[PDB]
């Protein structure tokens, strides 16, 4: 009765949302960008090969200086690299080696990691003694930590396999906000450029746009067929791309509340682990399970290039803030820089 | 170029520490402990978040990771264990109602593309409970596996002294139910080592050592290109 009534009300509301999305779907992004020129053949080359990780690399995050980067690999080490000279700036031994995410603070003073320990570990890079120590452990997630991103030195949004995200105060160690509504494992999160919103892609084939301060899910985006392992905002903050296990990337718009573009090819049958836009957002770079990365024209859905430089699963991918380079970290224990 | 040389020296010291820690890690054998709640997986070797059990056999150190603190959905976190030496799959062989669930889990592990290179040490635990279930005759495997009615004990079967033949047929039927999945795909890259075990058994660490030894022999043969 009541259950059935709520379920048919939910189906009515999904039909209303789908009809509104169909009403706003006057044209497609393929039609609007049909007349602009192609970007050509984007041929990035390996410039630096970051060697020193001795197990498979699971995550990476560029710093906002676009030179230092943090990499998380399951040898129990966070390495912070000077990408310009391939110099390792820090080697942080982790209490739990099963790390699945890392984040570099915008100030550059802190890094984060986490994984199967269900704890977001914040490390201070600017200690008085000069050694990197555990500044905070953020316990409270009841599932594995899959993504984390700093907003500043005091707040961090984490996503977890307990189907939730959480905005944490680092100083108090407490979840100031809990973001619930996903029904699968939340695999990735992406902060908006103003850091007022964030999208999170989960294992329910759905992405959710959340308000960081108001705390609720503002929008839910469907269209993917399988687990969304990867998410990244478009640089204007009005759109975002998702990478999933259904061998497709999808560009969704916030203000249109629907999928704008699918980036797929028939010879691609493997899932996407990482997505990142270029600085203008014209190139959508995606790391795949066929050991390669594809640069897609984000406006025309054409594969602009192939970063075929990894002997194992590309697990993470990141573009610098100034747009100079892309670092792809993979399961072959190497990170490679490309431009 | 004075702070640059200092950064290069710091990076080389970091490289030295990473190389030492990686050699130590390369000496540690990583294992993934998987099993249901009734399987008795915690009592196998008898030695929050992810739990780690460290034991040593013949100077070889094993880190067996029991992944607690996660939800029932495992298709993502299990990809963390691509590079483990073996997956120790513990099965309550007496719980006939969940043997199909254990077989489906074993099949999903055996055919996962990030787990198809990892050998599985199969512990068919609770063999005493399986024996007392078979000798009682109240619960029949044919009510859960009709092909057990057409199953015969293999000639290669090695029964325990004083073991009832119906108990032997039951335990080797459960073993062959897992080995049909194991031999159905992935021949050469990874092998399934079945072991019948109780909860009082103290030789499971030795069995893990022998199986891991076989696994490392085969991986070194593939590294040599002899196999």
């Amino acid at each position, epitope marked *: 009765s009541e259950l059935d009534q709520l379920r048919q009300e939910a189906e009515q509301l999904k039909n209303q949302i789908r009809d509104a999305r169909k009403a706003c779907a006057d044209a497609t992004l393929s039609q609007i960008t049909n007349n602009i020129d192609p970007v050509g053949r984007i041929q990035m080359r390996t410039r630096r090969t970051l060697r020193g990780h001795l197990a498979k690399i699971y995550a990476m995050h560029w710093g906002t200086d676009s030179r230092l980067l943090v990499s998380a690999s399951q040898d129990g080490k966070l390495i912070i690299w000077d990408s310009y000279t391939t110099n390792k700036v820090h080697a942080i031994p982790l209490r739990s080696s099963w790390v699945m995410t890392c984040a570099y603070a915008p100030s550059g003073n802190y890094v984060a990691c986490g994984g199967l320990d269900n704890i977001c570990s914040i490390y201070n890079l600017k200690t008085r003694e000069g050694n990197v120590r555990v500044s905070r452990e953020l316990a409270g997630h009841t599932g594995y930590l899959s993504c984390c991103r700093f907003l500043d030195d005091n707040q961090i949004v984490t996503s977890s396999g307990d189907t939730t995200c959480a905005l944490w105060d680092i100083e108090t160690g407490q979840q100031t906000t809990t973001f619930t509504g996903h029904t699968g494992d939340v695999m990735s999160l992406s902060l908006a450029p103003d850091t007022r919103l964030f999208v999170s892609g989960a294992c329910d084939a759905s992405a959710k746009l959340w308000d960081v301060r108001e705390g609720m899910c503002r929008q839910t985006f*469907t269209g993917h067929e399988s687990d969304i392992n990867a998410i990244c905002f478009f640089p204007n903050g009005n759109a975002f791309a998702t990478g999933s296990d259904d061998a497709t990337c999808r560009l969704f718009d916030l203000r249109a509340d629907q999928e704008l573009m699918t980036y797929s090819h028939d010879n691609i049958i493997c899932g996407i682990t990482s997505v990142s836009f270029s600085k203008s957002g014209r190139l959508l770079l995606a790391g795949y399970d066929d050991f390669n990365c594809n640069v897609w024209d984000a406006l025309k859905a054409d594969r602009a290039g192939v970063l075929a430089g990894h002997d194992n699963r590309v697990s993470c991918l990141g573009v610098t803030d100034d747009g100079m380079a892309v670092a792809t970290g993979s399961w072959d224990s190497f990170l490679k820089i490309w431009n | 170029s004075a702070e640059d040389k200092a950064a290069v020296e710091r990076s080389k010291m970091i490289d030295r520490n990473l190389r030492e820690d990686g050699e130590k890690a390369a000496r540690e054998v990583k294992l993934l402990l998987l099993g249901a709640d009734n399987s008795g997986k915690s009592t196998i070797v008898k030695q929050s978040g992810i739990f780690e059990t460290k034991f040593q056999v013949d100077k070889v150190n094993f880190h067996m990771f029991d992944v607690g603190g996660q939800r029932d959905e495992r298709r993502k976190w299990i990809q963390c264990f691509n590079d483990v030496t073996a997956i120790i799959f513990v099965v309550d062989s007496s719980d006939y109602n969940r043997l199909q669930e254990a077989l489906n889990l074993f099949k999903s592990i055996w055919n996962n593309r990030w787990l198809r290179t990892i050998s599985v040490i199969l512990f068919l635990n609770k063999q005493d409970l399986l024996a007392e279930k078979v000798l009682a005759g109240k619960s029949k495997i044919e009510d859960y596996f009709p092909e057990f009615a057409r199953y015969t004990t293999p000639e290669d079967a090695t029964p325990e002294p004083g073991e009832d033949p119906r108990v032997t047929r039951a335990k080797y039927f459960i073993r062959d139910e897992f080995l049909r999945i194991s031999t159905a795909s992935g021949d050469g890259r990874h092998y399934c080592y079945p072991h019948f075990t109780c909860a009082v058994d103290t030789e499971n660490a030795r069995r893990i050592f022998n199986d891991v030894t076989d696994i490392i022999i085969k991986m070194n043969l593939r590294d040599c290109g002899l196999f």
Partner: nanobody
Amino acid sequence: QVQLQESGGGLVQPGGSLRLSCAASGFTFSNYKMNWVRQAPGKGLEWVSDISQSGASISYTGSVKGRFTISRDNAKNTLYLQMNSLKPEDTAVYYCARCPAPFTRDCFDVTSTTYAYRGQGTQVTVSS
């Protein structure tokens, strides 16, 4: 939106027959191995049957072998479970569960409590 809608369940006599259908939408049906799972009253989620992407590799749980027939129509994107010779222990909420990743032989988490690529299920009651 990945949607699985099950129908055809209802009250049936012991020894009777039922045909479950599931309409699938939001994904390429032919790219996924498909599952039928059970939720008995008071028990956990139990896997029942699976049919491969093409429809060639079929397996059942042993309690339904010879009684249940899984099939798929990839053109109509529909999953069928023909439930002949029904027993009172088959009384359950039956769910159609899609395997989570396409083009895979492994099928993970389809019997999990909050699995996402699973329908709302239809109630099959086998009683006199």
